[PDB]
Amino acid sequence: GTISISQLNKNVWVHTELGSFNGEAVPSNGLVLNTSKGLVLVDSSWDDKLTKELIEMVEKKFQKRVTDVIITHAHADRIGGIKTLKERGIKAHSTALTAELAKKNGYEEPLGDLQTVTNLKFGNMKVETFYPGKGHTEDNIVVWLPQYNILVGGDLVKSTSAKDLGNVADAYVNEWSTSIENVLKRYRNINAVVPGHGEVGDKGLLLHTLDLLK
């Protein structure tokens, strides 16, 4: 099961891919939104190969085109497939900072169209992007589906089983708790929280992440 999709509701699924690192499978999550105007992903995958596999799978599953991807920060698990996106005319949305960091981290450039709070609408599917502040990276954003109170946390948000923050060389560890607090403040009645890696949970993941950061 290198690529798996799991349903939250009719039109919102989690995509999860196993990257292969040092002979270990390493899952990363994003979202798949099935809209009347196409599929919209939150995040790509670790690299172009997996991104292609992901796109092939979702397009086949839903018989719909991937039209847009929202990139939640400029690391491989999120942006690794940007070349695939660009050469397919799949729009790669990001904050300007993520775009700047993408170019620095050697990736092709996403759009830089997202602000601190941005509302997008794809068909009937409403999507909010929110930059809560620095944390896992300087640029990490989260994505919210206000119709369903589903939050995509990316690597800002740890799963319940996670006991480790991960790579913090370019993290803002002190600021990360504030950024999580900002997410907790903004999103009050959450049905699901998708962490960047690991099992989907609820607000408890945000609290858990705060706990790890204490």
Give the binding site for Zn ion (CB under 5 A).
Answer: 75, 77, 155, 196
Can 22 be counted among the known catalytic residues? Answer: no
- If the CB atoms of residues 128 and 155 are measured against Zn ion, the closer one turns out to be 155
Q: Which of 43, 47, 68, 77 is catalytic?
A: 77
Can 75 be counted among the known catalytic residues? Answer: yes
The distance of closest approach from Cβ of residue 73 to Zn ion in the complex, given in angstroms and rounded to an integer, is 5
Can 15 be counted among the known catalytic residues? Answer: no
Q: Which of 75, 93, 197, 208 is catalytic?
A: 75
- Check residue 22 and report its DSSP letter: T
Can 73 be counted among the known catalytic residues? Answer: yes
Can 155 be counted among the known catalytic residues? Answer: no
Nearest alpha-carbon partner for 151 in 18, 42, 26, 16: 42
The distance of closest approach from Cβ of residue 111 to Zn ion in the complex, given in angstroms and rounded to an integer, is 19
| C-alpha–C-alpha distance, residues 164 and 49, integer Å | 28
- If the CB atoms of residues 68 and 77 are measured against Zn ion, the closer one turns out to be 77
Residue 138, both tokens? 């300087």
| C-alpha–C-alpha distance, residues 108 and 48, integer Å | 12
Q: Which of 73, 93, 197, 208 is catalytic?
A: 73
| C-alpha–C-alpha distance, residues 190 and 184, integer Å | 9
Where residue 63 falls (left for φ over 0; alpha for ψ -120 to 50; beta otherwise) is left
The distance of closest approach from Cβ of residue 10 to Zn ion in the complex, given in angstroms and rounded to an integer, is 27
Nearest alpha-carbon partner for 153 in 56, 77, 84, 53: 77
Determine contact, residues 120/127, Cβ cutoff 8 Å: yes
The distance of closest approach from Cβ of residue 211 to Zn ion in the complex, given in angstroms and rounded to an integer, is 19
- Could you tell me the CA-to-CA distances from 176 to 13, 103, 107, 141, 191 in Å, in that order? 27, 23, 24, 12, 22
The distance of closest approach from Cβ of residue 138 to Zn ion in the complex, given in angstroms and rounded to an integer, is 11
Which residues are designated catalytic?
A: 73, 75, 77, 136, 167
